[PDB]
Amino acid sequence: SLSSTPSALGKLQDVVNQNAQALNTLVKQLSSNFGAISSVLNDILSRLD
Amino acid sequence: VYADSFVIRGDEVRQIAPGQTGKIADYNYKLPDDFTGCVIAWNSNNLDSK
Amino acid sequence: RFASVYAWNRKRISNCVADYSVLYNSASFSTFKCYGVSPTKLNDLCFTN
Known part of the structure; x- marks a missing residue:
């Protein structure tokens, strides 16, 4: 039964997926302007006084 | 207090x-970015313009 | 022969080297208002068209 059913261990896999999704959201929130002129620090620090 | 007086x-x-x-501000008199104080000015062509 | 308001003349400066410091240091201008950029950093920036 363990070998035949791919979704047998669906709780540990869900935990892993939840952690991966949280980390992906955290790392993808670095591309947001949040109101600034750019999402890159080195652009604001190179274009503005 | 520091009073810096000059004619421009x-x-x-x-x-x-x-x-x-x-x-004026890059070769003669540079004001700091975090300046706390006043900047008073007045036309004085009657006293500095003969 | 400066153009008119309703027919403002647009020129595309491209594929060259622009010495923005020359215009920036000139005293023959009354207003030099830069938005989104700074004149002191214009000499170190490479734009296009």
Whole structure:
């Protein structure tokens, strides 16, 4: 039964997926302007006084 | 208190301010960015223009 | 022969080297208002068209 059913261990896999999704959201929130002129620090620090 | 008095042109008064640029504020009198104080000015062509 | 308001003349400066410091240091201008950029950093920036 363990070998035949791919979704047998669906709780540990869900935990892993939840952690991966949280980390992906955290790392993808670095591309947001949040109101600034750019999402890159080195652009604001190179274009503005 | 520190009173820095000097005579400039008319279109150069705006150069006396933090972060401003111009021939007055980059070679003669640079104001710090974190400046706390007053900048008073007055036309005196009756006293400095013969 | 400066153009008119309703027919403002647009020129595309491209594929060259622009010495923005020359215009920036000139005293023959009344207003030099830069938005989104700074004149002191214009000499170190490479734009296009």
